[PDB]
From a paper:
To date, all Ads display a characteristic, icosahedral symmetry in which 240 subunits of the trimeric hexon protein form the facets and 12 copies of the penton, comprising the pentameric penton base protein and the externally projecting trimeric fiber, form the vertices. At least in vitro and for most cell types, the fiber mediates the initial attachment to primary receptors, such as the D1 domain of the coxsackievirus and adenovirus receptor (CAR), sialic acids, CD46, and others (for review see Zhang & Bergelson). Our results showing that the CAV-2 fiber head contains a sialic acid binding site creates a paradox: both HAd37 and CAV-2 fiber heads contain CAR and sialic acid binding sites - but HAd37 uses sialic acid and CD46, while CAV-2 uses CAR (CAV-2 does not use CD46 to infect cells, unpublished data) to infect cells. We show by structural analysis that the CAV-2 fiber head also contains a sialic acid binding site, but in contrast to HAd37 this site is modestly involved in hemagglutination.
Among the HAds, serotype 37 is unusual: its fiber head can bind CAR, CD46 and sialic acid, but the virus appears to use only the latter two as functional receptors. To determine if sialic acid and CAR binding were mutually exclusive, we soaked CAV-2 or HAd37 fiber head crystals in complex with CAR in solutions containing sialyl-D-lactose. Crystals containing the complex with HAd37 fiber head diffracted to 1.55 Å and contained one chain of fiber head in complex with one CAR D1 molecule and one sialyl-D-lactose molecule in the asymmetric unit (space group I23). For both structures the electron density maps showed clear density for sialic acid, but not lactose, at the expected positions on the fiber heads. The HAd37 sialic acid binding site consists of three residues forming hydrogen bonds (Tyr213, Pro317 and Lys345) and two residues contacting sialic acid in hydrophobic interactions (Tyr308 and Val322). Burmeister et al. found that the sialic acid moiety bound to a basic patch close to the center of the trimeric fiber heads of HAd37 and HAd19p. Our results demonstrate that HAd37 interaction with human erythrocytes is primarily due to sialic acid binding via a conserved sialic acid binding site on this subgroup D HAd fiber head. In addition, although HAd37 head also binds CAR, in the context of the virus it does not appear to use CAR as a receptor, possibly due to its relatively short fiber.
Author numbering:
A (entry chain B): 19 to 138
B (entry chain A): 184 to 365
Amino acid sequence: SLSITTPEEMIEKAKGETAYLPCKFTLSPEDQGPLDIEWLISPADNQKVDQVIILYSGDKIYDDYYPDLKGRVHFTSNDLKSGDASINVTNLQLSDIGTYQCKVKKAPGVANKKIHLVVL
Amino acid sequence: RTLWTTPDTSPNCTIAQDKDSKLTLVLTKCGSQILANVSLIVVAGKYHIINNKTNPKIKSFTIKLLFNKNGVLLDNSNLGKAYWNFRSGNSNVSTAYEKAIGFMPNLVAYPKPSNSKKYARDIVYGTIYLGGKPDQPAVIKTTFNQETGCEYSITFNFSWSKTYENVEFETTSFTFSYIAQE
Ligand SMILES: CC(=O)N[C@H]1[C@H]([C@H](O)[C@H](O)CO)O[C@@](O)(C(=O)O)C[C@@H]1O
Ligand SMILES: [Ca+2]
């Protein structure tokens, strides 16, 4: 079935640097639907629901979401549809620490990955 | 000379959580080729016990070794620095090395990603066996100089196709070589 490499991952990077958050996926032959990528963050406030970061949908990028990351998050691949939904986060702050989720869908295929990001 | 993790490392690798694995890696310099020997024991966390009946989508994970211009291992590598060093007996020399460019994967042989796709020759594939059982293959895919945020890199990807049920992820050993930077 549809799967993502290293579906739970811990990443550490230093303050001011750029984090590379990998989301490399493998499709199955049955996955003939439209490709849909969603990244989310779990806020440090545990009483707040997850927030959308960035989307790839209908071959377009939508990034007008989580304000703390606005302008700092981008898809890294020049060919995302070939299996690379990775993003980077520029100028890391200590407040960027948290759990990030990549959701890859191509109906009926679905997979998700969680990254625990630590900033030192 | 030999640059290594030692042959019986304490947990030295962080994949899903801190110190969840033991990567054994021995690099021995034979002039312009490095002779390499590798294995993995996962000791805790997501990848420790594989159960694809309960977790059908856990099929692949990656360990990255990132090096600076001096061949020094970077902090954000999955492999930890403390016991990655030149050998002394069955352990390491006491002081951290400052230079190991002669052990780095050659950048002309294996260039970083660019407008050019990396050729397949920048990869070596091997099959290892979980728990030493012949019916429990997994693939180790090793790529040279794939990664960003470093001068050099060695990436180890571990993957499998079979539906493993309660199989501990600890592998047989695999030997390969690569072209040295100098
Ligand atoms: C060491 C080795 O070569 N193992 C191979 C085995 C053995 O030949 C048989 O299990 C023994 O009967 O066969 C496979 O098809 C398997 O079981 O997945 C492929 C695997 O690579
Ligand atoms: Ca939470």
